[PDB]
């Protein structure tokens, strides 16, 4: 299955808002993710993709937009 399609479909499962077309939005500023909401996404991103996500290297400008989340998951999936 497609990496981009599953990230798009996990985001509106826990938070309930599709952001497929308007995708380069800052998810913190757009009101999608809480302080606690990011932790909830990380857990489900691990359960779905079988990848363990580095949160102690997680910068603020690193994994903020959905495109940087999609592209970051693929890099951690093989490389």
């Amino acid at each position: 299955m497609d990496v981009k399609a599953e990230v798009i479909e996990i985001i509106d499962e826990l938070f309930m808002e599709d952001v497929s077309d308007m995708m380069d939005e800052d998810l913190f500023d757009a009101g999608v993710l809480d302080s606690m909401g990011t932790v909830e996404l990380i857990v489900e991103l691990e359960s779905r993709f079988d990848i363990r996500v580095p949160v102690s290297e997680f910068g603020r400008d690193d994994w903020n937009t959905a495109n940087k989340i999609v592209e970051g998951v693929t890099e951690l999936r093989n490389a």
Partner: protein
């Protein structure tokens, strides 16, 4: 051999203005070198070892051996994990290596509870060095670190300007900064910032921290003691005076640390960002002892929240957030020391942050309660903002009174 180290000359780091004459002359080749994109690897360690040794050659100069033990002990368990992490990756192995890297620090803290005296493993920068050491175990665990020299590990862990108390650093960021020497005018920019930071540090440490710490604080304590009771007006005096003293002494130090680091080419993380104008307890920890807070945020808090959400241990979203806060700030208290008031100082900011967070949640639902019932949003203006600042400032200042351990003198001297 111990008597030799005690005979050896001693210079307390940033102890006086005339200290910077030595360090200035000493670092001058390093700085000039960086303009031609070269480092003097051998000379950098020599000048580092000299100043670290001079910082440790006190009346308890024997601690140099405790440092020597520490470097050996850390090399063993850092490399032990490095070797292991290549092939396998297990939870408990990582936990064991984490425990073992922090064990000397645990022994130093725990000791005077049992003994009433210090640990033999104790040396000056131990509390701040340990963060650099565990940092690598955590970074190897996350698979973000793979390659490193013994030289790269040693340069980072026992970096000279940030040794004794200086800003906490992470390996990946320190290493990359050291790896690529900044270009000619960016380097001159750092000289400008270094000469600025020294000027401020002079004012902060030798002028202001002097007035609060050595001038106002001692008679205020003396009076508060004579007054008696669980609180008095001179005790309200020590609360503010010490608070400012703590800030000015530590912030001034931090500026010196950053300035020397700059002359050494790398730019260490900053510690303070106008902490007293913070409206929020949440905002305060983004402004106070930042290198420590930002470490504890990513390495203790963030990591703990995932575990409580992996295992879904608590009922709702907010209890896992609350428990993480109280544990995280309490561990930070234990880090300061295993005495009642450091632990108190911990639990304080713990319940302080949960109260703070609960309010932000309540304010958003009161605003929705108003908007749907017709009414305009709850007022947010210059006086609500100031009120916030006022409440925060005094919560913060009261915590520093607990932290000072003066309440031990006032309540428990007997």
């Amino acid at each position: 051999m111990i008597d030799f180290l005690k005979q050896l000359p001693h210079l307390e780091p940033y102890g006086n203005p005339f200290y910077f004459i030595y360090l200035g002359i000493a670092l001058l080749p390093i700085f000039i070198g960086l303009f031609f994109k070269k480092r003097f690897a051998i000379y950098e360690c020599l000048v580092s070892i000299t100043f670290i040794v001079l910082a440790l050659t006190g009346t308890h100069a024997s601690q140099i051996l405790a440092l020597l033990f520490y470097i050996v002990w850390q090399i063993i368990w850092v490399y032990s994990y490095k070797r292991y992490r290549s092939q396998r990756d297990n939870k408990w192995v990582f936990y064991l290596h984490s425990f073992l890297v922090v064990l000397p620090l645990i022994l130093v803290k725990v000791e005077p509870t049992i003994n009433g005296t210090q640990s033999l493993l104790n040396f000056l920068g131990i509390s701040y060095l340990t963060f650099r050491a565990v940092g690598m175990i955590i970074e190897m665990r996350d698979g973000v670190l793979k390659e490193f020299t013994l030289g790269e590990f040693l340069r980072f862990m026992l970096f000279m300007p940030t040794f004794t108390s200086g800003p906490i650093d992470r390996f990946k960021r320190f290493n990359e900064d050291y790896q690529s020497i900044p270009n000619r005018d960016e380097l001159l920019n750092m000289l400008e910032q270094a000469v600025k930071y020294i000027m401020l540090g002079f004012l902060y440490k030798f002028v202001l921290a002097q007035i609060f710490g050595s001038m106002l604080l001692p008679p205020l304590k003396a009076q508060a003691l004579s007054q008696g009771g669980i609180f008095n007006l001179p005790t309200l005096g020590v609360m503010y005076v010490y608070g400012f003293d703590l800030f000015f002494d530590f912030a001034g130090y931090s500026m010196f640390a950053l300035a020397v680091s700059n002359l050494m080419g790398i730019k260490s993380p900053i510690n303070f960002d106008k902490p007293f104008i913070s409206r929020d307890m949440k905002e305060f920890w983004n402004r106070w002892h930042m290198s420590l807070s930002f470490w504890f945020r990513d390495f203790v808090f963030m990591r703990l929240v995932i575990v409580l959400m992996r295992n879904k241990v608590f009922k709702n979203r907010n209890t896992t957030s609350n428990v993480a806060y109280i544990i995280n700030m309490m561990v930070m208290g234990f880090w300061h020391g295993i005495t009642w008031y450091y632990i108190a100082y911990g639990i304080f900011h713990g319940i302080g942050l949960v109260i703070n967070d609960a309010w932000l949640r309540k304010k958003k639902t009161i605003n929705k309660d108003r908007k749907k019932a017709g009414l305009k949003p709850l007022p947010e203006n210059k006086w609500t903002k100031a009120l916030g600042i006022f409440i925060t400032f005094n919560t913060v200042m009261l915590s520093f009174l607990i932290f000072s351990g003066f309440l031990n003198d006032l309540w428990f001297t007997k």
